[PDB]
Amino acid sequence: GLPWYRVHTVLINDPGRLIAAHLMHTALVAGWAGSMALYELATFDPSDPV
């Protein structure tokens, strides 16, 4: 079968599932940003900007 390092080539000729993989990546990144913002809000001390 495919070597492990080629598993994502099954999408080269499959625009719909390429679009689906691109959406999932966009979802992961935006979700990262939401989570990182929240972690920072929970740990940020705003009482002295100096």
Partner 1 sequence: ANLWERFCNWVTSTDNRLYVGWFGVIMIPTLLAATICFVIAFIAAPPVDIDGIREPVSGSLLYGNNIITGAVVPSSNAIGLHFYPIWEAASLDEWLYNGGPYQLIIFHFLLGASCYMGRQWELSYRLGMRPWICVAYSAPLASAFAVFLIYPIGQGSFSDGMPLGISGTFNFMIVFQAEHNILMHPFHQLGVAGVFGGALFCAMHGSLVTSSLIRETTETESANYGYKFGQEEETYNIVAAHGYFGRLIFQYASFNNSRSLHFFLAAWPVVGVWFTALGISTMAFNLNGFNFNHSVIDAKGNVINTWADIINRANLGMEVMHERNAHNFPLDLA
Ligand X SMILES: CC1=C(/C=C/C(C)=C/C=C/C(C)=C/C=C/C=C(C)/C=C/C=C(C)/C=C/C2=C(C)CCCC2(C)C)C(C)(C)CCC1
Binding site for ligand CLA (CB under 6 A): 4-9
Nearest CA to 31 out of 41, 23, 42 is that of: 23
Could you say which of 2, 41, 42, 50 contacts partner 1 (CB under 8 A)? Answer: 2
Distance CA 7, CA 43 (A): 39
- Taking the complex as a whole, the smallest distance from the CB of residue 39 to ligand X amounts, in Å, to 11
The item of ligand X, partner 1, ligand CLA, none sharing an interface with residue 32, based on CB under 5 to 8 Å by kind, is ligand X
With contacts defined by CB under 8 A, name the span among 2-10, 18-26, 28-36, 37-45 that binds partner 1: 2-10
Residues in CB range of 11: below 8 A, 6 or more apart = 17, 18, 21
